[PDB]
Amino acid sequence: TYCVAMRLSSGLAFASDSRTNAGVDHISTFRKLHLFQQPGERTLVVQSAGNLATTQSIVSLLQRRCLDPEQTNLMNVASMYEAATLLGETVREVINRDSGGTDFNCNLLLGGQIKGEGLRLFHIYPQGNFIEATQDTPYFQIGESKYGKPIIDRVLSYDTPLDQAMQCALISMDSTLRSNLSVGLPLDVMIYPLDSFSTEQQYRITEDHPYFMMIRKGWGEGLVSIFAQLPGLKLGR
Amino acid sequence: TYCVAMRLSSGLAFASDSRTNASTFRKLHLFQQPGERTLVVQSAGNLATTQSIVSLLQRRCLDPEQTNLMNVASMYEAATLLGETVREVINRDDFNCNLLLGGQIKGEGLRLFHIYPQGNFIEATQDTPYFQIGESKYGKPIIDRVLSYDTPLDQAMQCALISMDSTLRSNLSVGLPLDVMIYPLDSFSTEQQYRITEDHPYFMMIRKGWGEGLVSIFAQLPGLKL
Amino acid sequence: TYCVAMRLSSGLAFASDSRTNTFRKLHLFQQPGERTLVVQSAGNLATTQSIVSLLQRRCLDPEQTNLMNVASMYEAATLLGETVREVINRDDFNCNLLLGGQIKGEGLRLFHIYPQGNFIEATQDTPYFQIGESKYGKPIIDRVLSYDTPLDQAMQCALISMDSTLRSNLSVGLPLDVMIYPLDSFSTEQQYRITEDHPYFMMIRKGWGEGLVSIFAQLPGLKLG
Ligand SMILES: [Cl-]
Structure with missing residues (x-):
């Protein structure tokens, strides 16, 4: 379970893996990027991490x-701010219900645009408050x-263009997939351009996805090449 | 004890064994309102606990x-109901159990839930x-090898039965007879409900064909090259 | 709605009408050879039907x-009270219950359960x-019934009581549900439904009515001075 969301001047970028811990011997694929869309007016994205029982209820209750x-x-x-208070309320409702403890805890990301305002992105905590x-x-x-x-700290800033932001997210995923087996393909990604109110750029990235394969190969070869050409080790004695 | 439930585009498939660790016990129970709702519940874990739950829900x-x-x-409120009942039984003074909850209520598509010992669910x-x-x-x-969301009802049940076959054979705590069920989308019928005994003809057929099929693939394998 | 129950040395007699404003106002919980319990209802129909349904379920x-x-029947009375209170807490709806019968190892017992859930x-x-x-x-009950009255005369008493009620109040009506429970029998055989066509009920009513008119006419003349 790994999700990232980026708020830039020109739009938002989202990336989520899908490998989910549902039970001990039950590690499965579940979608961690859900969409709330009214064409021409609003686009809201919710990303899930933490207890699968908790976030699915939260999403199911919001959808219903x-x-x-x-x-x-x-x-x-x-506004997106009201959307955030709403998620916080739905988070507390579900946790208090299921816990009759951190066993039921979740974190969520909420990002998007409601017409009449710019891009907004929130992180909702288990207690239901948010930043x-x-x-x-x-x-x-x-x-x-x-x-x-x-990698995000090295290359991403508020003014990074959307395609480079999504590229940054994909490499972030690459390094995470390589270092921790609890994160896994397929990926769910999306680019949301400012004022578009479009979910047209939503994508599922499987193991067979040609561009993800390519950028992982290009980045991997690129790093080892920089590494090999570093100036020689010079410690003082 | 082994139960499996599958949610596909064309319907739901269920299979349950009946053996419990020390006899025959039902591990698949149905709730029907003709034309309006069909709910299937499967049981695993502490026998006394699940039996108390099923009994409470039916009464x-x-x-x-x-x-x-x-x-x-909705099927979701039903999962919630199952969750409340689980906590109720456990709280009243290894008692862990798991339930599967599946079916359709008019106005919704097929829904399937896994209820955990804590009363929460996925x-x-x-x-x-x-x-x-x-x-x-x-x-x-075998389930991972052949089942996907678009798998037809008949092959999904064929998969469940093979799954049962490999299981019956490898662990003797799982045992015949079986109770299985196919629910076609929007049918609200429990008609395709079956008890599969050791004497069941198709089940004998499907086990032997599969068993024979595997030895053949194995025999046709390329020679070992390490 | 009118129900009566009698506990005598030799057994129990129950009679309930059925007119409501047809619903059963006498229920049986029967285990042959072991226990026979009768529950009678009056008052709020929603409350009473809810209580009775929970008990059966x-x-x-x-x-x-x-x-x-x-x-014991004492525990039976306690249970009824819990159910009365349980329904109250959940949700004017006054109800009253009569609980009579026998559980083996104990004698005849009869309780009146109140709306508050306590009982006598x-x-x-x-x-x-x-x-x-x-x-x-x-x-009529005060006039002829005592603890040692035989079952049959107690049932006669109950029926005459119904008769005066049926005649005087139109919220009470046929059919009747009646039962005679003999001591230690644990039987529901002498449970009967009494309709408008019931020959014996017709008979005692006319027999009773005629006798009273006869005593009345034979009274010594009025002398108030
Ligand atoms: Cl990988």
């Missing part, structure tokens, strides 16, 4: 309540995230 | 003033379209 | 206290209970 107009839901909140990405901290990670942080 | 179906499997609005997806509970490892590889 | 669960596994037990001094529209039928 979107069909009920007489209730506050992700389709009628006026918002800024230009100083333009990305969030949940799940097994440390392996993939160094 | 409370007779109580119209309480939330029960006949009046839950739902089957296109990415993970089946669940196993009990002694499940023996029978997992 | 729980008889199907042996891991729970129910009317089939309680050790019949004694030799107060050997019958009434619930519902009960005042019309009380004078």
